[PDB]
Amino acid sequence: VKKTVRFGEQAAVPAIGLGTWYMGEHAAQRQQEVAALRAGIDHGLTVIDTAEMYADGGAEEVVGQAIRGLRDRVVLVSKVYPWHAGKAAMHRACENSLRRLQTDYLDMYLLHWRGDIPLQETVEAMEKLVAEGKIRRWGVSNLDTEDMQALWRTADGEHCATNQVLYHLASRGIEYDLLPWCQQHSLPVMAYCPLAQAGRLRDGLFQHSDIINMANARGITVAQLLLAWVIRHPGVLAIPKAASIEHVVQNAAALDIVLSGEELAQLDRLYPPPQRKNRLDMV
Ligand SMILES: NC(=O)c1ccc[n+]([C@@H]2O[C@H](COP(=O)([O-])OP(=O)(O)OC[C@H]3O[C@@H](n4cnc5c(N)ncnc54)[C@H](OP(=O)(O)O)[C@@H]3O)[C@@H](O)[C@H]2O)c1
């Protein structure tokens, strides 16, 4: 079973990509960050996820340096603050992102979350960037099932190419409603915080005996086990962030893992799937 995802105008991207939140904050780390991204590309991870938010442009500048001369090898995803996502301001947000990335187009551009602009106006603005050639496709982030239904209802809202939401073993709420909805509409989901921020989100995911034993039993690390879990089913593209080369190399290698039913059942007993609607986890 191929560990790829149909994503925008790309027929198949690898199901693990590269996050950039917390890159670009410190000048002393820029070279290390550039190297971690290039390592990911060198290991076949092509999707890079960033945002105008991240270090106020800084992460985008890091990405732009990392991808110099490699633009055709990568699938670039950035995001626009909702307060920019309207007729007036959208072009400037997009143009500023493109300047920092030093590329003339994005593969995907996401509404970072839903603000006060009516969705119809954001959709029209995204469609204009598509017609101009500045973005190949648009999508959204942090939209729950109700918001996705509202979007679908808008003119051209069905062109939405992805929804990026929080998903990991210890926060599975999207499995009740949102993922099935996405699955029904052939919409790929981008899973952010797929490592729960290396466990910092949920106390003891990493420090868990049965998960530690399970990873040891196949000679993988817990992080790899958690990533393979996130991408176990089609239609989900995980975007772990790694500034460490050792970590990027691990993360790419998690594309080669096949979890058994026995293993997946054990994991469900440790962190059961949701049996009701849950508010969309975000962070
Ligand atoms: N749309 C949104 O609202 C939203 C919100 C949050 C995040 N995001 C996106 O999603 C991405 C992923 O989420 P995240 O950065 O919040 O958290 P994450 O990817 O779940 O975890 C990042 C942490 O995991 C560590 N790590 C990575 N690979 C590892 C490995 N193999 N072994 C051990 N530790 C490992 C990293 O350390 P090192 O860096 O030192 O390797 C980092 O400290 C973000 O970077 C961003 O692109 C989007």
Beta strands per DSSP E along the chain: 4-7, 10-14, 18-19, 47-49, 75-80, 108-111, 138-141, 163-166, 189-192, 236-238
CATH number of the domain at 83, please. 3.20.20.100
Q: Which residues of 242-253 are buried (b: 16+ CB within 10 A; e: fewer)?
A: bbebebbebbbb
Q: Give helix 222-230 / helix 209-217 axis angle, nearest 10°.
A: 90
- Residue 134 makes CB contacts below 8 A (sequence gap 6+) with 91, 94, 95, 98, 104, 105, 106
Task: Please tell me whether residue 193 adopts helix, strand or coil conformation.
Answer: coil
| Separation of alpha carbons 174 and 198, rounded Å | 20
Sign of torsion over alpha carbons 278, 279, 282, 283:
negative
Distance from residue 18's CA to the centre of ligand 1 (Å): 8
Which residue segment(s) compose the domain that 266 sits in?
1-283
| Separation of alpha carbons 207 and 250, rounded Å | 19
Pocket test for ligand 1, best of 21, 54, 171, 246 (most atoms within 8 A of CB): 21
**Would you call 279 exposed, middle or buried from its count of C-beta atoms within 10 A (0-12, 13-18, 19+)?**
exposed
State both tokens at 250.
């691990």
Distance from residue 108's CA to the centre of ligand 1 (Å): 20
Ligand 1 neighbourhood includes 242 CB (under 6 angstroms): yes
Closest residue by Cα to atom 8, ligand 1, is 192
Nominal resolution (angstroms) = 1.8
Ligand 1 neighbourhood includes 243 CB (under 6 angstroms): yes
Atom of ligand 1 nearest to the CA of 79: 1
Distance from residue 240's CA to the centre of ligand 1 (Å): 4
Closest residue by Cα to residue 281 from 144, 163, 189, 150 = 144
Phi, psi of 214 (to 5 degrees): -65, -40
Ligand 1 neighbourhood includes 167 CB (under 6 angstroms): no
| Separation of alpha carbons 111 and 113, rounded Å | 6
Q: Domain tally for the chain?
A: 1
Distance from residue 234's CA to the centre of ligand 1 (Å): 21
Atom of ligand 1 nearest to the CA of 246: 31
| Separation of alpha carbons 10 and 179, rounded Å | 21
Other residues' Cβ atoms within 10 Å of the Cβ of residue 4: 16
Method of determination used here = X-ray
Task: Please tell me whether residue 155 adopts helix, strand or coil conformation.
Answer: coil
Closest residue by Cα to atom 47, ligand 1, is 19
Maximum separation of any 2 CA atoms in the chain, in Å: 56
Closest residue by Cα to atom 48, ligand 1, is 192
Helices (H), ranges, 45-89: 58-66
Sign of torsion over alpha carbons 152, 135, 41, 206:
negative
DSSP letter for 108, please: E
Closest residue by Cα to residue 77 from 95, 63, 62 = 63
Helices (H), ranges, 144-188: 145-153, 178-184
120's enclosing H/E stretch is helix 119-132
